[PDB]
Amino acid sequence: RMKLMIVGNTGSGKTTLLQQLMKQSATVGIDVKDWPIQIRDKRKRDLVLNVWDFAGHEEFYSTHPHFMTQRALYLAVYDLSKGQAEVDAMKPWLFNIKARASSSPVILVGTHLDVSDEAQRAACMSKITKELLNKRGFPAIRDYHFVNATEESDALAKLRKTIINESLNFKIRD
Amino acid sequence: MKLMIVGNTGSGKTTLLQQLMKQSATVGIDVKDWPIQIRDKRKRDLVLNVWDFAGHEEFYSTHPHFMTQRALYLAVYDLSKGQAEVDAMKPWLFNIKARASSSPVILVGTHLDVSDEAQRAACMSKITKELLNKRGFPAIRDYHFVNATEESDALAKLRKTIINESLNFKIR
Ligand SMILES: Nc1nc2c(ncn2[C@@H]2O[C@H](COP(=O)(O)OP(=O)(O)O)[C@@H](O)[C@H]2O)c(=O)[nH]1
Ligand SMILES: Nc1nc2c(ncn2[C@@H]2O[C@H](COP(=O)(O)OP(=O)(O)O)[C@@H](O)[C@H]2O)c(=O)[nH]1
Ligand SMILES: [Mg+2]
Ligand SMILES: [Mg+2]
């Protein structure tokens, strides 16, 4: 019922982190794919169709705006190895998340710990504490983590625990 | 523009789309369930519906404005199970109207190849009598009967209809 949204910029490690974190029906519930189409009549290059394939009633129902905006926990992912600019790049994401719901909980995750310098990590921690944590106008940043997203580790296990706890505690206001 | 494919499970939605379809290295939006066995504050079964977004543009496309305004609907049903399945489209139509009040709908009966002419006749009669041009239902701008598992002239005409109505929706 609760949704875990994984957001961030491309190549930051979202899909890799989820695969590692995750380490019922016969079909997928919602399949989203792009369908490019060429037009017989020129002078009008068609866009592509963004196709949403729903398995049934329950899956369509789960995409009602109320669930999409008010029953979602966010993982905001960034690449530590590109430095403090990547924390800067999380600000437009937080503003966007806040606009969906004022009460959206967010867990910040920096990936690529294994190829990040100590200077980049300290710079990112300082930026998060100084500019992102408990700011009115941002979502509630419940926690923040630094992981190598490609392997198991104590740091990844604690992130799993944080996701479980925030989901269980979602029925609460901070 | 979004194409929303709705219907009940087993009606042929995925098969139909694969046949209809005959730019990024990764999927734009990946949705999957993650069941977690828990022992944190109790012990039940926690299933999270995970939405993995590629980037800003994919997240932007799920704004409630776009999920509900810029969408064209395929309402799919298994013609081989009889006019009961046309009846089952009514709750879908009411849901589409509530969700996307100006969105057009194309009705697609699949399993033509294993349907009899009695079921197809009963189905079109119920469509024309009970579904088309009703206030409270979306606009049904076309209806089709196909074998969704292979190419055919009927499937090609459905494909052209989907393309033309997507282009005309953006215009109107
Ligand atoms: N060394 C290292 N590579 C990572 C890490 N996380 C992701 N990657 C790599 O970054 C690249 C992009 O990963 P991907 O999950 O596709 O990013 P997405 O576009 O955000 O979903 C892949 O080569 C991944 O193996 C990490 O923690 N450490
Ligand atoms: N004989 C026949 N089988 C179909 C047709 N359309 C779908 N199927 C079959 O119905 C079953 C369910 O298909 P699927 O696409 O998974 O349905 P979905 O749950 O609505 O996505 C598959 O075995 C398909 O091969 C059709 O037009 N004719
Ligand atoms: Mg990805
Ligand atoms: Mg399917």
From Swiss-Prot, chain A:
Sites where the protein binds GTP: G8, N9, T10, G11, S12, G13, K14, T15
Modifications made to the protein after synthesis: Ubiquitinated by TRIM1; undergoes 'Lys-48'-linked polyubiquitination leading to proteasomal degradation.
PTM sites of type Phosphoserine: S103
Consequence of changing T10G: Decreased kinase activity
Domain Roc: 1-170
Consequence when changing R100G: In PARK8; shows a progressive reduction in neurite length and branching; shows an increase in activity in phosphorylation of RAB8A and RAB10; decreases phosphorylation-dependent binding to YWHAG; significantly suppresses lysosomal enlargement when overexpressed in LRRK2 knockout cells due to increased phosphorylation of Rab proteins
Tissue: Expressed in pyramidal neurons in all cortical laminae of the visual cortex, in neurons of the substantia nigra pars compacta and caudate putamen (at protein level). Expressed in neutrophils (at protein level). Expressed in the brain. Expressed throughout the adult brain, but at a lower level than in heart and liver. Also expressed in placenta, lung, skeletal muscle, kidney and pancreas. In the brain, expressed in the cerebellum, cerebral cortex, medulla, spinal cord occipital pole, frontal lobe, temporal lobe and putamen. Expression is particularly high in brain dopaminoceptive areas.
Subcellular location: Cytoplasmic vesicle; Perikaryon; Golgi apparatus membrane; Cell projection, Axon
Signal peptide start-end: none
Job description of the protein: Serine/threonine-protein kinase which phosphorylates a broad range of proteins involved in multiple processes such as neuronal plasticity, innate immunity, autophagy, and vesicle trafficking. Is a key regulator of RAB GTPases by regulating the GTP/GDP exchange and interaction partners of RABs through phosphorylation. Phosphorylates RAB3A, RAB3B, RAB3C, RAB3D, RAB5A, RAB5B, RAB5C, RAB8A, RAB8B, RAB10, RAB12, RAB29, RAB35, and RAB43. Regulates the RAB3IP-catalyzed GDP/GTP exchange for RAB8A through the phosphorylation of 'Thr-72' on RAB8A.
Assembly with partners or alone: Homodimer. Homotetramer; when activated by GTP-bound RAB29. Interacts with PRKN, PRDX3, and TPCN2. Interacts with VPS35. Interacts (via N-terminus) with RAB29; this interaction is direct and stimulates kinase activity. Interacts (via ROC domain) with SEC16A. Interacts with APP; interaction promotes phosphorylation of 'Thr-743' of APP. Interacts with MAPT. Interacts with RAB8A, RAB10, and RAB12. Interacts (via N-terminus) with RAB32.
Recorded disease: Parkinson disease 8: A slowly progressive neurodegenerative disorder characterized by bradykinesia, rigidity, resting tremor, postural instability, neuronal loss in the substantia nigra, and the presence of neurofibrillary MAPT (tau)-positive and Lewy bodies in some patients.
Family: Belongs to the protein kinase superfamily. TKL Ser/Thr protein kinase family.
UniProt comment concerning the protein's domains: The seven-bladed WD repeat region is critical for synaptic vesicle trafficking and mediates interaction with multiple vesicle-associated presynaptic proteins. It also mediates homodimerization and regulates kinase activity. The COR domain mediates homodimerization; it also mediates homotetramerization via interaction with the protein kinase domain.
Protein's UniProt name: Leucine-rich repeat serine/threonine-protein kinase 2
Species of the source: Homo sapiens (Human)
Gene (UniProt): LRRK2
